[PDB]
Amino acid sequence: KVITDQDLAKIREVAAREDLYSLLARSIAPSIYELEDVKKGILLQLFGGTNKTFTKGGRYRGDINILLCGDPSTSKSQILQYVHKITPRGVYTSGKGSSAVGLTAYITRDVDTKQLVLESGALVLSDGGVCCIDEFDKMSDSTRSVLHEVMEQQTISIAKAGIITTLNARSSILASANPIGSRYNPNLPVTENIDLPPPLLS
Amino acid sequence: TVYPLARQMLTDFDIRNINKLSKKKDIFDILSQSLAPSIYGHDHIKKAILLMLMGGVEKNLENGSHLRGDINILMVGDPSTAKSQLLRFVLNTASLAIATTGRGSSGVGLTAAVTTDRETGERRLEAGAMVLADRGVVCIDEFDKMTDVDRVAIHEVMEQQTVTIAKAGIHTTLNARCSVIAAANPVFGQYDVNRDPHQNIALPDSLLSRFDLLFVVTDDINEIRDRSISEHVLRTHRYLPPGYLEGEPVRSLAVGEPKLVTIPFLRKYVQYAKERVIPQLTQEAINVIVKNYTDLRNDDNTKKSPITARTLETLIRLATAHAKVRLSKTVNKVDAKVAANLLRFALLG
Amino acid sequence: LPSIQLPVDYNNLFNEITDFLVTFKQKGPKYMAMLQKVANRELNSVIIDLDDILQYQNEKFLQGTQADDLVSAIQQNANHFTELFCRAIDNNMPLPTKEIDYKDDVLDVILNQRRLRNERMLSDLFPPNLTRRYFLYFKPLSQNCARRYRKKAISSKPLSVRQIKGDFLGQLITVRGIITRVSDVKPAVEVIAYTCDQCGYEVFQEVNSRTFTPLSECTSEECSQNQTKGQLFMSTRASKFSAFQECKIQELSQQVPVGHIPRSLNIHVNGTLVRSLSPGDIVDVTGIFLPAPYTGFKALKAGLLTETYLEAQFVRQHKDVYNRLAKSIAPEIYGNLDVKKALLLLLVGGVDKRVGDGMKIRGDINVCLMGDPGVAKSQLLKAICKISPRGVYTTGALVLADNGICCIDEFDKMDESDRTAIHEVMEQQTISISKAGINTTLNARTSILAAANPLYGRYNPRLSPLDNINLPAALLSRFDILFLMLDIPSRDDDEKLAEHVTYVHMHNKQPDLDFTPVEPSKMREYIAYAKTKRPVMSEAVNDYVVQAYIRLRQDSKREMDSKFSFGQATPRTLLGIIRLSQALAKLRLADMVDIDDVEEALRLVRVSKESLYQE
DNA sequence: AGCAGATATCACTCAGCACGA
DNA sequence: TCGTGCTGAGTGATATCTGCTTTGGGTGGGTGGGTGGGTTGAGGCAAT
Ligand SMILES: Nc1ncnc2c1ncn2[C@@H]1O[C@H](COP(=O)(O)OP(=O)(O)OP(=O)(O)O)[C@@H](O)[C@H]1O
Ligand SMILES: Nc1ncnc2c1ncn2[C@@H]1O[C@H](COP(=O)(O)OP(=O)(O)OP(=O)(O)O)[C@@H](O)[C@H]1O
Ligand SMILES: Nc1ncnc2c1ncn2[C@@H]1O[C@H](COP(=O)(O)OP(=O)(O)OP(=O)(O)O)[C@@H](O)[C@H]1O
Ligand SMILES: [Mg+2]
Ligand SMILES: [Mg+2]
Ligand SMILES: [Mg+2]
Ligand SMILES: [Zn+2]
């Protein structure tokens, strides 16, 4: 085809460094200029919170979701590409994109074998990682409902083709958005500019 | 044996008669009037149909640019204006002609269908409406009752005069060099003078621009015209065929075998002119054409169709067709004047 | 099997062939030298020139020893003469002059051991094609030679697929057309070698059909005698194979009659001619038209109807600088200097894309043309696509455009799926396929040329530029340069346009005579040279570009305060400016980027949109 | 044309006895 | 208890004849199946 003790020692030495936060923020996005706060938020999302498995309470999610909205001139897709390059697990997707595998699980036919196969979506494949959605603005209603379910229950349920199954989707989301027009108008509120439902944006 | 039933043999007497008739100054008027004697009026549309039948000269340049000699005609008007009857007449008179409807046709049925050969069991192509009518005329009725899916095929046909097929491992280009004559109705079903031309006709502007001439015909109520049309229709409806008694409803021997011009003679004339004449342009016709184009394009008066560089090509094509009408080897000032008059009537009425 | 008396004597023809091979001269004999080369393993293909045969016949007739017409006999029935010539060559093969490692070849050892076994048996054989190490082909009779000797050259006369009828079967004919399909090279078996587990002997089989039945039982003398039942097992090491390729040739457009569909004819390529035909090339394939009989139950069920193919034998393959280049791009159109310069900049596409930090600035100077009907958008598209080596013309194919400009017509009418495809092409420069059937990702660093019409068909001055454009604002922003073309009536311009068109129609040539257009070949090779070139920029020019950027940003913000502005300047506009400057430097053939190039790029940017909008 | 099932006519093994040794 | 035939019918065996069926395509069908292939075009339907 074309972790060791020393690695742990190096990790501990790096952690002992005083300016570790700034170092990690700089290392995440060397080519992006003057977005320290966004880089810090991205770093914190990458590390993620603690997953709690509660008896009597249920499940509390430790993931962090960040929305990157603003003018189109600024660098927003490069940040997503960097996050993909850094995250151990994740998938790149754009809403309403035929090239991408898809955001939701679906039942398909194996052309190769003429067999029925249940294929998992991008969100499912990102379990435990960061799923970057490049174009959040343009998206199907169905896809929006699936995103809401994933960000609410953290599982995807399908009851089609005679199959009743639930797939784990414990993954973080880092989406990007653009305004309705050629620019974001400061006078109007963010909800109007981004053109997304208040529920999904909250 | 296989006996064709398409090209009429020309005799020396027929050729001499054709030449003698062509030498008349008003040959164009007589020939235009001889088309569809049962249709009252529509003289300009008849002239346009005659010029379309005669057709221009097709020139292909060395660099690769291809200039078609076919003339396309579109008629948009109110109901009961003799558009369908004109289409039927041009279907009957033209040597090669194919009739299609808006709602009766499909994209595949127009271009070509992939099928299998019984004899050989080999995947092949079946010619469509467009293909079948190569070097002929295709009459499309109810042009506005179509679908965009279907419209795309036609758009490609007129724009390139060729058919491109990519199906079932078939990669080929089919020659489709046919003149398109079509009839359509306004969106409201009746032309409205107040509303602009764009609103009246729903067809795409790109598709519209390919038609050399656009004729807008409206049914106007006038006592004199109404009386004339009614009398003409009543006279036509009283016709009886030879060898038939009054009240009798209308029902081969061998195999090998200002006066109106009879249809067979018209067909012979058209064949002769389209076969043995290739008019060439001259300087005077060019001066007239450029003067007319400059005057029409930059003029305050509104036009039912926008002026464009395609109008210059349309003028040249009409001049060439009129030259063909007279059996003249060169395009003269008369041809340019006639083409300019026809275009001006079609544009500004 | 009733017999016929035909006026052909194959013995005399074989003598003729042997005499021609031995004696013909055109130093020593040409074909004797060719056979000597073949013996030393220097040549693996022998081509018989019918012109040589005709000349030899003419010389023999002149000398008074008139001989049979060999050219006509070869042309009328070429399948037999291939074998006849092979036999003649074998009977007169010269001894090798360069020592070779005989023991290396498996066939040599096997035949030597068969000879030893035969000698042992006597003390108490193989097909000729097996040992042949050459291929024989017939070169058609050239028209010039035939006319020199007062003869008709049927073989070399081009024919269409339709003109190839059933009466041409078994003859040497030429076909003119365009190759539409070529298959992969595969080994076709000619002689099969078997082995006996018990005997220890080798058996051989000749294949001259689509299908064959393998041997099962030993036929050796030893086996027969001893009554030993030994099974035969196929051995691919000692078998003989020949490269095989199947191609499809289709009729040219000018050859099809009126109201007819083109037809195709199969072609079979054997020996060293493989890989001589590729899709899309117009060729003059010379071969032997032969039938392909069926076998077994198919044969019985088919009937008398026969398939046909062509055995390929010969293949003939058919064939102030800025202002000058711009004017020579499309002489037939009325002068549009700025658009032509933009097209040159797109075509050359000079850029330095080596960031190495994870991404790299796009290396394509994309151009989009939008205007009301009447401008020669189609003509610019076709011309610029023709000149480009990788230019691809499509109507609303990307793979063919990889590392090259894409010529897209009717851009606005394109479907949304293709819009997303081109969006992926621009932002990511990658083509991705996600299907059950296959999953392949091909890189696509291809530029795009787009032609579109306004929303209403014609530009409306009242509406803002964004309103007239149906495409998403992001796509417009991503375009490096956007040129807006409009048709404004005017006496002078209309008169000149009409005069130009009329002159073109009459004289079928460019009316302009003030300047002589540059030759297209020179222009394309100059473009290639410029592409091969790599420029470089300094810090002072960088600071100048920064200053120009701040000025442009302020001006664009002030303009966008009103609704007339197409859009605010963005860092994408910067990157486009540097890309244009690098392309212009590549044009100049000077490594250092000069301030003049930056100023020219800025003026091009201004005149692409503002020049026409202000009008 | 090739393949699988079947018929029938082809030999070969153990069987055993008469002479004499 | 060895050697040499003569008898012999039994137990094979192998050299030797008698009937499908097939390709693929409706010149075998839909009480052989549609996951063994064909298969692009028109048509009607529901969710959109
Ligand atoms: N802070 C920054 N540092 C470096 N480059 C930047 C910065 N802000 C913007 N850019 C440049 O802006 C351009 C933005 O490109 P990018 O692919 O990120 O766009 P985008 O956010 O996807 O745009 P759109 O909304 O139009 O699709 C890139 O050339 C990037 O170099
Ligand atoms: N100028 C005319 N002279 C004689 N008959 C006419 C004339 N105009 C219309 N008609 C009569 O109209 C009848 C039907 O009209 P026709 O089918 O020709 O209309 P059309 O132009 O195709 O209109 P539409 O398709 O919109 O209804 C024909 O039988 C013809 O007799
Ligand atoms: N400057 C010009 N000089 C000469 N002929 C021209 C010129 N501009 C346009 N034409 C003519 O205009 C005719 C039609 O226009 P063309 O197809 O070239 O482009 P377009 O109008 O942009 O096309 P579309 O109608 O498909 O949007 C062409 O035959 C071409 O000959
Ligand atoms: Mg983006
Ligand atoms: Mg009608
Ligand atoms: Mg165009
Ligand atoms: Zn053997």
In terms of phi and psi (left: phi > 0; alpha: psi -120 to 50; beta: otherwise), the region of C227 is left
With contacts defined as CB-CB under 8 Å, which chain B residues touch C499? 290
Atom from ligand 3 closest to the CA of residue B209: 25
With contacts defined as CB-CB under 8 Å, which chain B residues touch C490? 298
- Asked if A129 contacts A172 with a C-beta cutoff of 8 angstroms, the reply is yes
Residues 86-125 of B with CB under 7 A from strand E: 106-109, 113-114, 116, 118, 121, 123
Q: Which of A74, A77, A92, A136 to mutate to test the pocket of ligand 1 (most atoms within 8 A of CB)?
A: A74
With contacts defined as CB-CB under 8 Å, which chain C residues touch B124? 261
Q: Which two tokens stand for residue B141?
A: 């009725």
Per-position DSSP letters for A93-124, written without gaps between them: E-TT-SSS--SS-EEEEETTTTEEEEE--HHH
Phi then psi for residue A106, to 5 deg, are -150, 155
- Asked if A24 contacts A43 with a C-beta cutoff of 8 angstroms, the reply is yes
- Asked if B215 contacts B75 with a C-beta cutoff of 8 angstroms, the reply is yes
- Asked if C264 contacts C248 with a C-beta cutoff of 8 angstroms, the reply is yes
Smallest CA separation from ligand 2 atom 24, residue: B79
B237 close to C (CB below 8 A): no
Contact flag C568-A97 (C-beta cutoff 8 Å): no
A71 is in an annotated binding site: yes
SS3 B257: coil
C354 is in an annotated binding site: no
Smallest CA separation from ligand 1 atom 28, residue: A75
Per-position DSSP letters for A41-77, written without gaps between them: HHHHHHH----EEETTTEEE-----EEEES-SSS--H
Interior/surface letters C17-47, b for 16+ CB within 10 angstroms, e for the rest: bbebbeebeeeebebbebbbbbbeeebeebe
CB atoms within 10 A of CB A114: 7
- Cα nearest neighbour of C506 on chain B: B281
Helices B83-93, B43-54: crossing angle, 10 deg rounding: 30
Per-position DSSP letters for C112-143, written without gaps between them: HHHHHHHHHHHH----HHHH---EEEEEPPPH
Q: What's the burial of C610, exposed, middle or buried (CB within 10 Å: 0-12/13-18/19+)?
A: middle
How far B144 CA sits from the closest chain C CA (Å)? 18
Q: Which of B32, B102, B11, B54 is nearest to B270 (CA)?
A: B54
**In angstroms, what CA-CA distances link C67 with C12, C32, C75, C88, C150?**
9, 21, 17, 18, 17
CA-CA distance, C447 to C463, in Å (whole number)? Answer: 30
B258 is in an annotated binding site: no
Per-position DSSP letters for B281-322, written without gaps between them: --HHHHHHHHHHHHHHHT-SS--SS---HHHHHHHHHHHHHH
Q: What's the burial of C391, exposed, middle or buried (CB within 10 Å: 0-12/13-18/19+)?
A: buried
Phi then psi for residue C344, to 5 deg, are -60, -45
CA-CA distance, B15 to C17, in Å (whole number)? Answer: 61
Phi then psi for residue A150, to 5 deg, are -65, -45
Smallest CA separation from ligand 3 atom 18, residue: C376
How do the residues of chain A divide into helix, strand and coil, expressed in percent and rounded to 5?
35, 20, 45
B313 close to C (CB below 8 A): yes
How far A91 CA sits from the closest chain C CA (Å)? 14
| Maximum C-alpha span of chain A | 59
Q: Which of C552, C551, C576, C555 is nearest to C564 (CA)?
A: C555
How far is ligand 3, taken at its centre, from the CA of residue C376, in Å? 4
Q: Which of B310, B312, B316 to mutate to test the pocket of ligand 3 (most atoms within 8 A of CB)?
A: B310
CA-CA distance, C448 to C363, in Å (whole number)? Answer: 12
CA-CA distance, A63 to A79, in Å (whole number)? Answer: 19
CA-CA distance, B31 to B261, in Å (whole number)? Answer: 7
Experimental technique of record: cryo-EM
CATH of domain C320-608: 3.40.50.300
Smallest CA separation from ligand 2 atom 26, residue: B79
Task: Name beta bridge partners: C452.
Answer: C370
Q: Which of C313, C343, C310, C307 is nearest to C328 (CA)?
A: C343
Locus of tokens 């660093």:
C445
Strands (E), C493-610: none
Chains B and A touch (3+ CB pairs under 8 A): no
C546 close to A (CB below 8 A): no
Q: Which of C538, C540, C539, C536 is nearest to C589 (CA)?
A: C536
Going across the sheet that includes B73-77, the strands are B97-101, B137-141, B179-184, B73-77, B213-217
How far A186 CA sits from the closest chain C CA (Å)? 14
CA-CA distance, C120 to C465, in Å (whole number)? Answer: 98
Q: Which of A38, A151, A147, A134 is nearest to A92 (CA)?
A: A134
Interface test with B, best of C161, C453, C501 (most B CBs within 10 A): C501
Nucleotides of E under 7 A from a protein CB: 21-26, 35, 37, 39-43
Per-position DSSP letters for C228-269, written without gaps between them: ---BEEEEEEEEEEEEEEEEEEE--GGGS-TT----EEEEEE
Q: Which two tokens stand for residue B139?
A: 């009459």
Q: Which of C380, C383, C360 is nearest to C370 (CA)?
A: C380
A145 is in an annotated binding site: no
Is the minimum distance from the CB of B185 to ligand 2 under 6 angstroms? yes
The chains in contact with chain C, meaning 3 or more Cβ pairs closer than 8 Å, are A, B
CA-CA distance, B40 to B228, in Å (whole number)? Answer: 9
- Resolution in A for the shown PDB structure? 3.3
**In angstroms, what CA-CA distances link C581 with B287, C201, C326, C572, C598?**
46, 77, 17, 14, 5
CA-CA distance, A195 to A185, in Å (whole number)? Answer: 12
Candidate from C256, C456, C506 with C-beta closest to B175: C256
Strands (E), B56-101: 59-60, 66-67, 73-77, 97-101
Per-position DSSP letters for C450-518, written without gaps between them: EEE--TTSS--SSS-HHHH--S-HHHHHH-SEEEEE-----HHHHHHHHHHHHHHHHHSS----SSPPP
Centroid of chain to Cα A99: 18
Give B137's Cβ-side CA count (13 Å radius): 25
Centroid of chain to Cα C209: 31
DSSP C309: E
Is the minimum distance from the CB of C504 to ligand 3 under 6 angstroms? no
Candidate from B62, B172, B294 with C-beta closest to C491: B294
- Asked if C227 contacts C198 with a C-beta cutoff of 8 angstroms, the reply is no
Contact flag B308-C506 (C-beta cutoff 8 Å): no
User: Beta strand A165-168 with A155-158: parallel, antiparallel or unpaired?
Assistant: antiparallel
Smallest CA separation from ligand 1 atom 18, residue: A75
H-run or E-run covering C587: helix C571-588
Return all residues near C138 (Cβ < 8 A) that are at least 6 apart.
Answer: C47, C48, C50, C74, C78, C81, C82, C172, C286, C288, C313, C314
Contact flag A82-C358 (C-beta cutoff 8 Å): yes
Strands (E), C6-111: 45-49
- Asked if B185 contacts B144 with a C-beta cutoff of 8 angstroms, the reply is yes
- Inter-chain CB pairs, B–C, below 8 Å: 93
Phi then psi for residue C164, to 5 deg, are -85, 100
- Asked if C328 contacts C520 with a C-beta cutoff of 8 angstroms, the reply is yes
Q: What angle do CA C275, C281, C282 make, to 5 degrees?
A: 120
Phi then psi for residue C188, to 5 deg, are -105, 125
- Inter-chain CB pairs, A–C, below 8 Å: 50
How far is ligand 3, taken at its centre, from the CA of residue B53, in Å? 25
Strands (E), B66-136: 66-67, 73-77, 97-101, 112-116, 123-127
Radius of gyration of chain A (CA): 19
DSSP C217: B
DSSP C591: S
